[PDB]
Design an enzyme around this catalytic site. Structure first.
Site, PDB file in Angstrom:
ATOM      1  CB  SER B 200      -0.950  -0.030   1.200  1.00  0.00           C
ATOM      2  OG  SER B 200      -2.104   0.748   0.951  1.00  0.00           O
ATOM      3  CD  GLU B 329      -5.215  -4.314  -3.863  1.00  0.00           C
ATOM      4  OE1 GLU B 329      -5.399  -3.774  -2.744  1.00  0.00           O
ATOM      5  OE2 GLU B 329      -4.151  -4.884  -4.180  1.00  0.00           O
ATOM      6  CG  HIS B 442      -5.550  -2.273   0.606  1.00  0.00           C
ATOM      7  ND1 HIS B 442      -4.889  -2.168  -0.601  1.00  0.00           N
ATOM      8  CD2 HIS B 442      -4.959  -1.379   1.434  1.00  0.00           C
ATOM      9  CE1 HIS B 442      -3.923  -1.271  -0.497  1.00  0.00           C
ATOM     10  NE2 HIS B 442      -3.948  -0.773   0.725  1.00  0.00           N
TER      11      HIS B 442
HETATM   12  N1  LIG Z   1     -15.460   7.259  10.263  1.00  0.00           N
HETATM   13  C1  LIG Z   1     -14.827   7.646   9.091  1.00  0.00           C
HETATM   14  C2  LIG Z   1     -15.592   8.168   8.002  1.00  0.00           C
HETATM   15  C3  LIG Z   1     -14.961   8.555   6.841  1.00  0.00           C
HETATM   16  C4  LIG Z   1     -13.546   8.446   6.673  1.00  0.00           C
HETATM   17  C5  LIG Z   1     -12.779   7.930   7.765  1.00  0.00           C
HETATM   18  C6  LIG Z   1     -13.450   7.532   8.967  1.00  0.00           C
HETATM   19  C7  LIG Z   1     -11.397   7.687   7.590  1.00  0.00           C
HETATM   20  C8  LIG Z   1     -10.558   7.151   8.714  1.00  0.00           C
HETATM   21  C9  LIG Z   1      -9.381   7.810   9.071  1.00  0.00           C
HETATM   22  C10 LIG Z   1      -8.603   7.303  10.114  1.00  0.00           C
HETATM   23  C11 LIG Z   1      -8.990   6.143  10.786  1.00  0.00           C
HETATM   24  C12 LIG Z   1     -10.164   5.487  10.430  1.00  0.00           C
HETATM   25  C13 LIG Z   1     -10.940   5.995   9.394  1.00  0.00           C
HETATM   26  N2  LIG Z   1     -10.830   7.939   6.387  1.00  0.00           N
HETATM   27  C14 LIG Z   1      -9.369   7.656   6.265  1.00  0.00           C
HETATM   28  C15 LIG Z   1      -8.916   6.590   5.263  1.00  0.00           C
HETATM   29  C16 LIG Z   1      -8.529   5.257   5.934  1.00  0.00           C
HETATM   30  C17 LIG Z   1      -8.714   4.010   5.052  1.00  0.00           C
HETATM   31  C18 LIG Z   1      -8.983   2.775   5.923  1.00  0.00           C
HETATM   32  C19 LIG Z   1      -8.433   1.454   5.360  1.00  0.00           C
HETATM   33  C20 LIG Z   1      -6.937   1.361   5.323  1.00  0.00           C
HETATM   34  C21 LIG Z   1      -6.189   0.863   4.268  1.00  0.00           C
HETATM   35  N3  LIG Z   1      -4.874   0.895   4.497  1.00  0.00           N
HETATM   36  N4  LIG Z   1      -4.756   1.417   5.695  1.00  0.00           N
HETATM   37  N5  LIG Z   1      -5.953   1.693   6.200  1.00  0.00           N
HETATM   38  C22 LIG Z   1      -6.246   2.295   7.519  1.00  0.00           C
HETATM   39  C23 LIG Z   1      -6.257   1.281   8.677  1.00  0.00           C
HETATM   40  N6  LIG Z   1      -5.221   0.256   8.436  1.00  0.00           N
HETATM   41  C24 LIG Z   1      -5.415  -0.710   7.445  1.00  0.00           C
HETATM   42  C25 LIG Z   1      -4.239  -1.148   6.778  1.00  0.00           C
HETATM   43  C26 LIG Z   1      -4.360  -2.117   5.741  1.00  0.00           C
HETATM   44  N7  LIG Z   1      -5.543  -2.658   5.391  1.00  0.00           N
HETATM   45  C27 LIG Z   1      -6.663  -2.260   6.023  1.00  0.00           C
HETATM   46  C28 LIG Z   1      -7.836  -3.060   5.803  1.00  0.00           C
HETATM   47  C29 LIG Z   1      -8.961  -2.881   6.565  1.00  0.00           C
HETATM   48  C30 LIG Z   1      -8.972  -1.892   7.590  1.00  0.00           C
HETATM   49  C31 LIG Z   1      -7.864  -1.124   7.820  1.00  0.00           C
HETATM   50  C32 LIG Z   1      -6.655  -1.275   7.054  1.00  0.00           C
HETATM   51  C33 LIG Z   1      -3.250  -2.345   4.853  1.00  0.00           C
HETATM   52  C34 LIG Z   1      -2.209  -1.469   4.840  1.00  0.00           C
HETATM   53  C35 LIG Z   1      -1.941  -0.739   6.031  1.00  0.00           C
HETATM   54  C36 LIG Z   1      -2.967  -0.476   6.899  1.00  0.00           C
HETATM   55  C37 LIG Z   1     -11.506   8.433   5.264  1.00  0.00           C
HETATM   56  C38 LIG Z   1     -10.834   8.823   4.088  1.00  0.00           C
HETATM   57  C39 LIG Z   1     -11.509   9.474   3.064  1.00  0.00           C
HETATM   58  N8  LIG Z   1     -10.844   9.851   1.919  1.00  0.00           N
HETATM   59  C40 LIG Z   1     -12.894   9.743   3.218  1.00  0.00           C
HETATM   60  C41 LIG Z   1     -13.569   9.361   4.345  1.00  0.00           C
HETATM   61  C42 LIG Z   1     -12.893   8.694   5.411  1.00  0.00           C
END
Ligand SMILES: Nc1ccc2c(c1)c(-c1ccccc1)[n+](CCCCCCc1cnnn1CCNc1c3c(nc4ccccc14)CCCC3)c1cc(N)ccc21
Ligand SMILES: Nc1ccc2c(c1)c(-c1ccccc1)[n+](CCCCCCc1cnnn1CCNc1c3c(nc4ccccc14)CCCC3)c1cc(N)ccc21
Ligand SMILES: *[C@@H]1O[C@H](CO)[C@@H](O)[C@H](O)[C@H]1NC(C)=O
Ligand SMILES: O=S([O-])[O-]
Ligand SMILES: O=S([O-])[O-]
Lengths: 538, 538
Positions: B200, B329, B442
């Site tokens: 990622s 993804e 992902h």
């Molecule tokens: N309540 C809300 C509503 C709208 C938005 C929110 C939260 C969040 C958010 C931010 C911080 C923590 C939690 C959520 N994000 C931020 C984007 C975060 C994407 C989450 C998935 C992801 C993907 N890669 N990293 N992550 C963050 C957590 N760590 C993960 C990781 C990995 N995979 C996953 C898979 C599932 C869940 C989490 C996750 C792989 C790589 C590293 C981290 C958004 C981004 C946006 N552009 C729009 C809306 C929202």
């Protein structure tokens, strides 16, 4: 009459007729050929709506096909059967408004379902007298009454100065409607049931059938309809009032009639028929394929609105329609001036040639729309493969002009209450003289629907004979009942109605019916839903 | 005291700990400082090399996690919390971890360097799924991972300024890399054979080290898992970074002669970390998904141009790259703000909900452009089907953000002399707690590559343990030779290189390698070649 065959003398509203006893393979049939249904549209009547034929005296000889309407004779490949079988087989003359009738011999005692054929040829060519439109086999084998008419083509049929009275447009369609009225009044003399008339036709003929469906005064003149590889909707079958005026004016100018509409049409009327034909091709706005100079116009009269509008808002509950396509609708159009293509080689083109083909094939398309087409048809695993590009160019032309319009037609009609049956025709005549790469071209199911293979002297395979019998049973079962399926038969795979929910249609080939779902579903979404909007917004 | 656990690096002595792997002991050196803590006035600045220390430094535990937003979408749920910080949060976080075999390797060993993802706003090298012991013990590798600054601290930029030049998180990574060059030999690692790998945001980072000249003499091979430096999310422009930075400053009360750069950064530095993290998500220009507030910036320094431009013109001849994607993804991102999706139900969606999801998924899209995505992704046989629409929404997000950027990257590197291997990871962990509809989300190849299924207490199936052993071999084989294939084992089938012509890649699942062609070719042509013409033209 003294020593005449009593089955060949028949009276109609215009007078007495003498027909001819013809040999079909299974037995005799009656033909009445060259029955005039209108005053010859010559002299001061050029461009005008047709008038009903004035009654004659004595017995009019109706033993031979009459004149073919003025047109452009194909000289692309001289002596080549593939092109010449479509070329006129009688003298060219503006005096050409005649129809033909085939009935069983003897004429049947109880009223028979009537099939009316409307030839194609891009609204610029064609004749009901071609060998492939021979009604004798349907007549003999299926006990049917079959009618076909000549109608005016090219300028003579469709040159319009819209809003004018002396050249209103659509007069080719008005000939067709006049022939339908003739069938209403007269077909009972031949033992036909005027309460059971099915129109059928292919390409421009199909487009014409659809136009009768969409024109109210035609609606009471038939009950069922078959559209083979053509539709009233789509890019080639109609022009706006404006475009028709422009084309009419340009043509006038080219033949020495400079432009007041009375003055102009008067001067066009003094021009020799050949001069008009000799110039009709010069009035198209772009280098292009599958576009014709003089076609039905949206006049706010015969067509009260664009076919796109009329099919979107029409109530079609009472209507039963059989529609469909051949496997390679586009291929044949390519050899008519798309650089790279020919019947005498494999037509393996380059990517450049494809992009070039696409601009010609989609002439109304901006640069961006053209890229969209190209990008959609490209095989991205082999974006340079000459074979795949050749086939793509064929599919672009086929899909844009026939398949996807048929798809849109079937969709709208079925949503709006019609019973629709759909097919794709996939059998290549064993006797075709076009090269293998062209697959099943535009027009080549016709000879099967008409039953030509049953004529042993034509060298069709035995398998092809059986296949033709099937198709004849489908079409006429559809004429008879509104269902191509056989009442007695019992799997025997059934042909299901085409619906929006399931988008079922059948394959017609040497194998029994296979049901398929989605008629180029994804690709037609491109042409019917996406492309318009790449002109709607940019 | 254990001589294996005592190492002398440049800045002083270390004591590592002997850890237990299923098949034998490993030496680990956790929490090694590689930079002066970047705190106080060093916030937003390039890292500085860590000062020498006296005595023996305790390196037996993971150090603090870089300051970041903690996920609370599903409190208590493993699926989200397994990515959350597992050590205390601190701005003092520039420490790296080394795992080696026990005993120390006799001759120089290939070195793998891990860079976590977390969208440039989260992540930690200390997470269990990044546990480097299995690779160390089984494959005899030296595996390194560093912490780097994330979110505002790592990437807040006022371009053109000395105080906040941007890209400092990448510089953190670069310093860790430089540290490995200077020190890894003492651990038995071979500094002339360093393979960067990451997932990622981690993969994009690796991509950026490929694309930045100073980083290029610090490694020899690269592995990008589910991420790329090009694409819609991994970078922003100097103008857009400035905008977000300036907006953040404003949101936290900054500012109340200098000026207005120095001034602004000065005030930001006076603010408690949590204040910056409180307001980081409020600087994004639209409701979106897979967009992150503070990401690497196109500065003309670290990145001399856009990655897209850099990958277009680079000479990549002495370079080997392994790239790939997971089967699903996009699925994980949907539960983070896309109306209609949730882990606690099957998330069956309406069409309206699909269109709305597209606008949020493709934040930059115009009406027409969004419509194109919709029309492209629809299943025209069942266009109303809630399963498909849900799956399509998932595919839009993955394709737009990961898969098609990968395809493009793979294509350019191969075109320009790099040697590329590509994969798609399709096996869904049996231990997974996200619902079935999310498939292989992902992030969920990582546990397999790192060999966690070798720990019998983690309750992976026998099949998965064997699968994990294969992937560990593909990756370390690739690290050893630039070729993931087993150099002494025969029978395969072979993982062939990715090339622009043949577009070959493999699926990694429980079944043996299967070679496929074209990484989602038609769809990526939509995303890489058409949509861009629909942004910058209409
Ligand atoms: N309540 C809300 C509503 C709208 C938005 C929110 C939260 C969040 C958010 C931010 C911080 C923590 C939690 C959520 N994000 C931020 C984007 C975060 C994407 C989450 C998935 C992801 C993907 N890669 N990293 N992550 C963050 C957590 N760590 C993960 C990781 C990995 N995979 C996953 C898979 C599932 C869940 C989490 C996750 C792989 C790589 C590293 C981290 C958004 C981004 C946006 N552009 C729009 C809306 C929202
Ligand atoms: N030497 C050149 C070079 C470029 C062009 C040429 C000739 C011709 C042409 C002119 C007069 C006569 C024949 C062709 N046309 C005019 C239109 C050509 C349309 C061809 C296919 C067609 C469609 N409807 N009627 N026809 C005419 C031939 N009749 C056929 C028909 C059908 N099927 C087939 C299948 C293969 C060959 C012919 C054929 C089925 C329905 C009825 C007629 C063009 C039209 C263009 N827009 C561009 C280039 C050319
Ligand atoms: C086929 O012939 C035509 C003209 O006769 C030519 O333009 C075209 O390039 C030819 N194609 C091949 C593959 O030789
Ligand atoms: O002559 S046949 O091939 O149309
Ligand atoms: O994140 S859990 O489902 O392994």
């Amino acid at each position: 009459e003294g020593r005449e065959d009593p089955q060949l003398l028949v009276r109609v509203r215009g007078g007495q007729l003498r027909g001819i006893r013809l040999k079909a393979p299974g037995g005799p049939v009656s033909a009445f050929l060259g029955i005039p249904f209108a005053e010859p549209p010559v002299g001061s009547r050029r461009f005008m709506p047709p008038e009903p034929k004035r009654p004659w005296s004595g017995v009019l000889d109706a033993t031979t096909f009459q004149n073919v309407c003025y047109q452009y004779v194909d000289t692309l490949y001289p002596g080549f059967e593939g092109t010449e079988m479509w070329n006129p087989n009688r003298e060219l003359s503006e005096d050409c408004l005649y129809l033909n009738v085939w009935t069983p011999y003897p004429r049947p005692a109880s009223p028979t379902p009537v099939l009316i054929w409307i030839y194609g040829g891009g609204f610029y060519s064609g004749a009901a007298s071609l060998d492939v439109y021979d009604g004798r086999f349907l007549a003999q084998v299926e006990g049917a009454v079959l009618v076909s008419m000549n109608y005016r083509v090219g300028t003579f049929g469709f040159l319009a100065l819209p809003g004018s009275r002396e050249a209103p447009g659509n007069v080719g369609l008005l000939d067709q409607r006049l022939a339908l009225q003739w069938v209403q009044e007269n077909i009972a003399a031949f033992g036909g049931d005027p309460m059971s008339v099915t129109l059928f036709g292919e390409s421009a003929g199909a487009a014409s059938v659809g136009m009768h469906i969409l024109s109210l005064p035609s609606r009471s003149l038939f009950h069922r309809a078959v559209l083979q590889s053509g539709t009233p909707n789509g890019p080639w079958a109609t022009v706006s009032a404006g475009e028709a005026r422009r084309r009419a004016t340009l043509l006038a100018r080219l033949v020495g009639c400079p432009p007041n509409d009375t003055e102009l049409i008067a001067c066009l009327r003094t021009r020799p028929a050949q001069d008009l034909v000799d110039h009709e091709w010069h009035v198209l706005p772009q280098e292009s394929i599958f576009r014709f100079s003089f076609v039905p116009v949206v006049d706010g009269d015969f067509l009260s609105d664009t076919p796109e509008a009329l099919i979107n808002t029409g109530d079609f509950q009472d209507l039963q329609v059989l529609v469909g396509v051949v496997k390679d609708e586009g291929s044949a159009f390519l050899v008519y001036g798309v650089p790279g293509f020919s019947k005498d080689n494999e037509s393996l083109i380059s990517r450049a040639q494809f992009l070039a083909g696409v601009r010609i094939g989609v002439p109304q398309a901006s640069d961006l729309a053209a890229e969209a087409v190209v990008l959609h048809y490209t095989d991205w695993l082999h974006p340079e493969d000459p074979t795949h590009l050749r086939d793509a160019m064929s599919a672009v032309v086929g899909d844009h002009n026939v398949v996807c319009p048929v798809a849109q037609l079937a969709g709208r009609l079925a949503a709006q209450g019609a019973r629709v049956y759909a097919y794709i025709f996939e059998h290549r005549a064993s006797t075709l003289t076009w090269p293998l790469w062209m697959g099943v071209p535009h027009g080549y199911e016709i000879e099967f629907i008409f039953g030509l293979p049953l004529d042993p002297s034509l060298n069709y395979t035995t398998e092809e004979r059986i296949f033709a019998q099937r198709l004849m049973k489908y079409w006429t079962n559809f004429a008879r009942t509104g269902d191509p399926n056989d009442p007695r038969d019992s799997k025997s795979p059934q042909w299901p109605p085409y619906t929006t929910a399931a988008q079922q249609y059948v394959s017609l080939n040497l194998k029994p019916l296979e049901v398929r779902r989605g008629l180029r579903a994804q690709t037609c979404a491109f042409w019917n839903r996406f492309l318009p909007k790449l002109l709607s917004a940019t």
